[PDB]
Amino acid sequence: VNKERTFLAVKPDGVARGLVGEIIARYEKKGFVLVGLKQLVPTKDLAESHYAEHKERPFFGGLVSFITSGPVVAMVFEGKGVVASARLMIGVTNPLASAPGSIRGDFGVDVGRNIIHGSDSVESANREIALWFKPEELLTEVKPNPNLYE
Template structure:
């Protein structure tokens, strides 16, 4: 059975504030495997597809404007329970409600600048991974320390 995968993106505010290394480190220390990574400034079309579920909401245009305002670090992480675990690492959407020790709890203060996005379900993860990455951009590899991180 293939390990679960999740899409995670460091938003323009996180990139501009120099938080990429800090955030990558948290996922690596947790023991997840990075199988896709790129930095891009999303097109409006990509942003509108990504946030399509919010199309009728009053904040949709602002979301699209923000995510296209600068570089985004798009990632695919793999591991057992990575979707739920990533959500715990990331913290509540509203940074003021996020627990200390989470990415948003430690590094963000405003919902409009909450640093990071993570898939919330397997279906969402599959959609987002397919939207942001081609299959050729994902690397299937085995970390040399895998036997020390996960029991078979």
């Protein structure tokens, strides 16, 4: 279905480096529709819930500390295969191993400062969207380009 959604968040390093517009533009050019967007400074509670799956991993501490250190731009994009496509556009966890053309491939060098977060599955996307956005903050009627879909 062309109504799948994914959650993306430009982390504090991405915001501080002035890459918000660059990132949003890549997704708009692709044809995905922006259905939610806001800038906020995450609380420790939000950070810990969002990254809950990593609680027993060694990088969790710094991960949570870093995401709550400055503004984050949260967004929700809608479109066919958006979760997997958005990941391909981001690259892989390690920016140095991400291919030129992807976001981390073009702009990142350190795994701890990898610019953006993207849901890894439809299940985690649905969970993240509900965590960061209230229902009234999301567009209900989406209208993409019919030049995009058959």
